Amino acid sequence: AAQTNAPWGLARISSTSPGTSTYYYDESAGQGSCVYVIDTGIEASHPEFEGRAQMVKTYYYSSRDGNGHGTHCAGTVGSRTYGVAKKTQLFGVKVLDDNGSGQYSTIIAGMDFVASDKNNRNCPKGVVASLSLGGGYSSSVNSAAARLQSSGVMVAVAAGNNNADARNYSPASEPSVCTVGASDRYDRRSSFSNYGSVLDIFGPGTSILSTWIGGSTRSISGTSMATPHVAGLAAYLMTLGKTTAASACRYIADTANKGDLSNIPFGTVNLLAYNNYQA
Numbered sequence: 478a479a480q481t482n483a484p485w486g487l488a489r490i491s492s493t494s495p496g497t498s499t500y501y502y503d504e505s506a507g508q509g510s511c512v513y514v515i516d517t518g519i520e521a522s523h524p525e526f527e528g529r530a531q532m533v534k535t536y537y538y539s540s541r542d543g544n545g546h547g548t549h550c551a552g553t554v555g556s557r558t559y560g561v562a563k564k565t566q567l568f569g570v571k572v573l574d575d576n577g578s579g580q581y582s583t584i585i586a587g588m589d590f591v592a593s594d595k596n597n598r599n600c601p602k603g604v605v606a607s608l609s610l611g612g613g614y615s616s617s618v619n620s621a622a623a624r625l626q627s628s629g630v631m632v633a634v635a636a637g638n639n640n641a642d643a644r645n646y647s648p649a650s651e652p653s654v655c656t657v658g659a660s661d662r663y664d665r666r667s668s669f670s671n672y673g674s675v676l677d678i679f680g681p682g683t684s685i686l687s688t689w690i691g692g693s694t695r696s697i698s699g700t701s702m703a704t705p706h707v708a709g710l711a712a713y714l715m716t717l718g719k720t721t722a723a724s725a726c727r728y729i730a731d732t733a734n735k736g737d738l739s740n741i742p743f744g745t746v747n748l749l750a751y752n753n754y755q756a
């Protein structure tokens with residue numbers, strides 16, 4: 478399949494080079510997979526989700542996304558126009574309030590929720606969780622992410638937006654999950670992107686167009702935007718049978734575009750997520 482005039486990040490994920498605008502992908506499109514978006518929620522009624530999105534849990538007085546950032550992330554995972562995996566099922570877990578904040582204890586509960594909740598969902602091709610959030614180092618937050626991963630969920634987490642070593646942030650610093658840095662449309666490391674040995678992969682994170690609340694759309698930037706590209710890619714690859722939750726991060730790293738990014742500090746991987754789709 479070919480989507481013309483796709484957002485640059487989608488085009489990038491199916492290309493060996495920057496500067497193109499068509500997204501190429503297998504028509505399977507993540508059908509039969511599921512992606513949990515653990516965030517401010519998802520506006521499931523957005524036409525872009527085509528009924529494939531649902532809120533499954535909130536820790537607040539509503540499950541509505543009153544912020545937009547969860548909806549944006551979900552859009553990059555699986556919206557019809559802005560998504561990587563255009564036929565995946567999207568499950569929203571609202572661990573962040575409408576100001577985008579959340580206590581670590583709530584975030585941890587949300588991760589444990591997903592590890593159990595997948596047993597109540599139909600995801601024959603596999604389960605992914607996208608965590609576009611973080612904070613200072615916490616062994617408890619890292620352990621929660623590790624449990625989620627261990628339970629059979631491909632966990633993708635944002636590296637963080639501090640232009641610093643991700644070793645000092647959680648869940649970014651958890652070795653067993655897939656930690657995602659951000660790049661821009663000219664293959665530069667995004668100016669805000671964290672880096673370090675704990676990063677596994679980079680994805681498009683600067684100026685990313687996706688869904689927003691009120692049935693709208695929006696371009697924003699962050700490792701939060703890079704993460705759902707990788708989560709969506711994982712779901713897509715699992716539907717194709719290329720990989721599994723336990724080794725998707727390794728598979729993505731092994732099949733990535735290599736050595737193409739600029740301003741990658743010595744000791745950080747120079748790997749950009751790539752679907753290796755040959756039309």
Ligand SMILES: [Ca+2]
Nearest residue numbers: 652653654677
């Ligand atoms: Ca890792």
